[PDB]
Amino acid sequence: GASKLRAVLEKLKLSRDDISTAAGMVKGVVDHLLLRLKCDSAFRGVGLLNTGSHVKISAPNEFDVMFKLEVPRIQLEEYSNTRAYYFVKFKRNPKENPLSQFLEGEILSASKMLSKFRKIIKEEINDIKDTDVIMKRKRAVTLLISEKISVDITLALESKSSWPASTQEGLRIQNWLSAKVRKQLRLKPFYLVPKHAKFQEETWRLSFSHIEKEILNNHGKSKTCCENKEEKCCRKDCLKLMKYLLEQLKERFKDKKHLDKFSSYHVKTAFFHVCTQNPQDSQWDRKDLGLCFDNCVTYFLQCLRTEKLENYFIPEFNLFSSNLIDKRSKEFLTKQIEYERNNEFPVFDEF
Amino acid sequence: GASKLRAVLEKLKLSRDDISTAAGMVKGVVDHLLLRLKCDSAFRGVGLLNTGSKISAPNEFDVMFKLEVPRIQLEEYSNTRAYYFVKFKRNPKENPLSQFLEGEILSASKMLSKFRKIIKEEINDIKDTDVIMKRKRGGSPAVTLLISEKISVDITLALESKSSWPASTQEGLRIQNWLSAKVRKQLRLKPFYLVPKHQEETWRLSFSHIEKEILNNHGKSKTCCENKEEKCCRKDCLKLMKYLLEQLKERFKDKKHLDKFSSYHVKTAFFHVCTQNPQDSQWDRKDLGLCFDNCVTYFLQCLRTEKLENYFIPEFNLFSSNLIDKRSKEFLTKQIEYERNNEFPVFDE
Ligand SMILES: Oc1cc(-c2ccccc2)nc2nnnn12
Ligand SMILES: Oc1cc(-c2ccccc2)nc2nnnn12
Ligand SMILES: Oc1cc(-c2ccccc2)nc2nnnn12
Ligand SMILES: [Zn+2]
Ligand SMILES: [Zn+2]
């Protein structure tokens, strides 16, 4: 039964037009912040990474923006055999490095880097008069435009180097998107977002947000997938429904605090794993949406039970490790998803 | 019947290993010429566009030398949708090619002369191999070298423009139902080249790079020719069409009719057949004989009707009566039809 699923997708599609006006407010504020950030020597080569402007299917008043900063000849040192967290050290000596001010030894400080970023942003939001902009407290930088629109702003270092060795056996798209696409994609840059690891406040985590967008917007085995009536698939619709399932349950149990650790990234990672399992476009037929979404729900639940959700790019990194998410939280999310699946998804009818 | 076709392809595949040694000699000479060419102010940003990787000629290599030109303005010559005059848009800073300006227009002749002059000067200086420069024949194959008395290298100069493709290409590259519209959008965002081809002041459009991309990523499916269940015969049909023309051109070299026909005509016609048959199922390995017969058949229709449109410039007809006379197309038709009727005797060896 896909009827109620297709009904949800149409209701979600009705929020599309309002996202245009809201994006206009965000484009204004972000263009301003990038003009003022480019004035500082450190953040001179700062730019917009070119994806979002949504990241929450039930949130037109929520936008995510990424600010790329190209870093020239960098050396990475993997922190404590975590295949995702690294220390950013510099390789060349000439000429003087613009980020020298944030070096806490030979290692670039994430904390000192993000503090200056937060400081310049706090300073420039008071000077912008077009709209009312407030900066939200530490929980990278979240703004609130005209008391409605929230903007999550991330700083990401860009490296045009070859991807770290931890990614060598990841991105298993060879039997789905082809090995020739995998070769082309790995030649693209990689990003590092400042994220500390279990209290190491000097580490950076790998980011492949750009590759995830490429793979989602060119998602079929066939190059003409979703370009004609005979080749329409339900891949994107399954992801939208999985994302919405978690958002609705997270909203339902916001006062409980269990589901706070789960994100749309867990849903998206699990979705790419199901795409690797079902490489044929015939396995994603529009008529089979109900059955396709049930495999996605089912795979996601297996990851929760087995406490195993590997990062799509870093196979050895487990997003569902007991050290990251406690078993009782995964058991609560399992309980809730199973109830929903057993009662024809009541949480879809805004519950 | 594909047996004799598959046999020819295996014999052509046996020339592959010798092409490695020969390419080594060419990589040496070309890397030298590019190092010396980069010394001149005009040809500073010169680079190789990478063709050094005729199906019956391992002692014959073609190389393209790209040169990026910044803010160029094109003026279409006499409603030819392929020939253009190269002008420059901005004023600051001074243009490195100012020496070749024959008015506000960049001279092809003055540009190619300096190119031929630096190349003639550097072939005498380079050691460890005997290199001779062959005399003028055509404007498109611009400078021809002869390494160690065996290897011929055709060196072409091409201007690179990162601008949007001219309006004459707007309705070309009909790969939307085969390679997808999203690929067509990605491909058109790439640069375009202009090779000096004459009116001895014009430049012709070149999309050699797009032809290579389309040939090396040729299926509807992204995994086409990456597994036993997805092996196609597209490349093999092109290799056989190219070899059919080369063998007939050799046979009638003393007659002079087929001199105007090139592998580009065969390749253009092949891309038109790919547009007609967008499905990988239409190019099954088992159906090679039937696939090659459609290619032969389409090519013959173009010869009879005197109509072979450029794959990128629809309004440009490569088989125009003004380019190739009717009696020459009729001779090539006669010969191809005889070959097809007698199980291709020109193939066997
Ligand atoms: O782009 C990303 C990346 C990651 C991430 C987590 C663990 C290891 C590696 C990468 N998590 C994320 N959560 N939201 N976005 N997002
Ligand atoms: O790349 C090309 C392009 C052309 C060509 C001919 C007529 C109009 C436009 C372009 N002809 C060619 N012959 N060999 N290569 N090659
Ligand atoms: O080599 C040939 C060629 C032809 C032939 C016929 C019509 C037009 C052109 C060529 N016919 C032939 N009959 N025997 N040999 N043979
Ligand atoms: Zn699709
Ligand atoms: Zn193929």
mmCIF file with all atom_site columns, C-alpha atoms in Angstrom, chain A residues 174-181 184 217-225 227-228 231 280, chain B residues 175-183 186 216-224 226 230 279:
data_model
loop_
_atom_site.group_PDB
_atom_site.id
_atom_site.type_symbol
_atom_site.label_atom_id
_atom_site.label_alt_id
_atom_site.label_comp_id
_atom_site.label_asym_id
_atom_site.label_entity_id
_atom_site.label_seq_id
_atom_site.pdbx_PDB_ins_code
_atom_site.Cartn_x
_atom_site.Cartn_y
_atom_site.Cartn_z
_atom_site.occupancy
_atom_site.B_iso_or_equiv
_atom_site.pdbx_formal_charge
_atom_site.auth_seq_id
_atom_site.auth_comp_id
_atom_site.auth_asym_id
_atom_site.auth_atom_id
_atom_site.pdbx_PDB_model_num
ATOM 1  C CA . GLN A 1 174 ? 30.545 0.060  -8.581  1.00 0.00 ? 174 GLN A CA 1
ATOM 2  C CA . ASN A 1 175 ? 27.647 -2.366 -9.239  1.00 0.00 ? 175 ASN A CA 1
ATOM 3  C CA . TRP A 1 176 ? 25.030 0.498  -9.017  1.00 0.00 ? 176 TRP A CA 1
ATOM 4  C CA . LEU A 1 177 ? 26.484 3.797  -10.356 1.00 0.00 ? 177 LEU A CA 1
ATOM 5  C CA . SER A 1 178 ? 29.601 2.128  -12.029 1.00 0.00 ? 178 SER A CA 1
ATOM 6  C CA . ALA A 1 179 ? 33.293 2.013  -11.187 1.00 0.00 ? 179 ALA A CA 1
ATOM 7  C CA . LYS A 1 180 ? 33.989 4.737  -13.745 1.00 0.00 ? 180 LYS A CA 1
ATOM 8  C CA . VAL A 1 181 ? 31.693 7.137  -11.705 1.00 0.00 ? 181 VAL A CA 1
ATOM 9  C CA . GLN A 1 184 ? 35.446 10.368 -11.131 1.00 0.00 ? 184 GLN A CA 1
ATOM 10 C CA . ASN A 1 217 ? 20.686 13.970 -7.952  1.00 0.00 ? 217 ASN A CA 1
ATOM 11 C CA . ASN A 1 218 ? 22.160 11.340 -10.381 1.00 0.00 ? 218 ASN A CA 1
ATOM 12 C CA . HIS A 1 219 ? 20.940 8.168  -8.648  1.00 0.00 ? 219 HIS A CA 1
ATOM 13 C CA . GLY A 1 220 ? 20.079 5.559  -11.268 1.00 0.00 ? 220 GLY A CA 1
ATOM 14 C CA . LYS A 1 221 ? 21.966 2.750  -13.018 1.00 0.00 ? 221 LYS A CA 1
ATOM 15 C CA . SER A 1 222 ? 20.467 4.143  -16.250 1.00 0.00 ? 222 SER A CA 1
ATOM 16 C CA . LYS A 1 223 ? 21.593 7.661  -17.130 1.00 0.00 ? 223 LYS A CA 1
ATOM 17 C CA . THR A 1 224 ? 17.930 8.540  -18.108 1.00 0.00 ? 224 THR A CA 1
ATOM 18 C CA . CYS A 1 225 ? 16.496 7.354  -14.723 1.00 0.00 ? 225 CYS A CA 1
ATOM 19 C CA . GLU A 1 227 ? 13.721 11.525 -17.189 1.00 0.00 ? 227 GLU A CA 1
ATOM 20 C CA . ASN A 1 228 ? 10.688 9.610  -18.713 1.00 0.00 ? 228 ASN A CA 1
ATOM 21 C CA . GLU A 1 231 ? 11.959 5.148  -16.188 1.00 0.00 ? 231 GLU A CA 1
ATOM 22 C CA . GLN A 1 280 ? 18.848 -2.076 -10.335 1.00 0.00 ? 280 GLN A CA 1
ATOM 23 C CA . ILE B 2 175 ? 22.094 12.560 -26.755 1.00 0.00 ? 175 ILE B CA 1
ATOM 24 C CA . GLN B 2 176 ? 19.058 13.280 -24.454 1.00 0.00 ? 176 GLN B CA 1
ATOM 25 C CA . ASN B 2 177 ? 17.215 9.989  -25.134 1.00 0.00 ? 177 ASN B CA 1
ATOM 26 C CA . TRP B 2 178 ? 20.544 7.985  -25.186 1.00 0.00 ? 178 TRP B CA 1
ATOM 27 C CA . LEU B 2 179 ? 23.088 9.479  -22.732 1.00 0.00 ? 179 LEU B CA 1
ATOM 28 C CA . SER B 2 180 ? 20.477 11.739 -20.896 1.00 0.00 ? 180 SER B CA 1
ATOM 29 C CA . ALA B 2 181 ? 19.777 15.459 -20.868 1.00 0.00 ? 181 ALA B CA 1
ATOM 30 C CA . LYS B 2 182 ? 21.661 15.806 -17.584 1.00 0.00 ? 182 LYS B CA 1
ATOM 31 C CA . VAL B 2 183 ? 24.881 14.539 -19.378 1.00 0.00 ? 183 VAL B CA 1
ATOM 32 C CA . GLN B 2 186 ? 27.280 18.729 -18.165 1.00 0.00 ? 186 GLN B CA 1
ATOM 33 C CA . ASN B 2 216 ? 34.542 6.075  -23.670 1.00 0.00 ? 216 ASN B CA 1
ATOM 34 C CA . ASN B 2 217 ? 31.212 6.434  -21.727 1.00 0.00 ? 217 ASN B CA 1
ATOM 35 C CA . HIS B 2 218 ? 28.807 5.306  -24.459 1.00 0.00 ? 218 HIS B CA 1
ATOM 36 C CA . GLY B 2 219 ? 25.938 3.400  -22.880 1.00 0.00 ? 219 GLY B CA 1
ATOM 37 C CA . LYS B 2 220 ? 22.484 4.308  -21.539 1.00 0.00 ? 220 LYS B CA 1
ATOM 38 C CA . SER B 2 221 ? 23.447 2.211  -18.483 1.00 0.00 ? 221 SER B CA 1
ATOM 39 C CA . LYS B 2 222 ? 26.390 3.565  -16.481 1.00 0.00 ? 222 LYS B CA 1
ATOM 40 C CA . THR B 2 223 ? 27.782 -0.052 -16.167 1.00 0.00 ? 223 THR B CA 1
ATOM 41 C CA . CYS B 2 224 ? 27.677 -0.665 -19.980 1.00 0.00 ? 224 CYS B CA 1
ATOM 42 C CA . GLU B 2 226 ? 31.705 -3.370 -17.211 1.00 0.00 ? 226 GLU B CA 1
ATOM 43 C CA . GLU B 2 230 ? 26.209 -5.703 -20.240 1.00 0.00 ? 230 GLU B CA 1
ATOM 44 C CA . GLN B 2 279 ? 19.105 1.363  -26.026 1.00 0.00 ? 279 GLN B CA 1
#
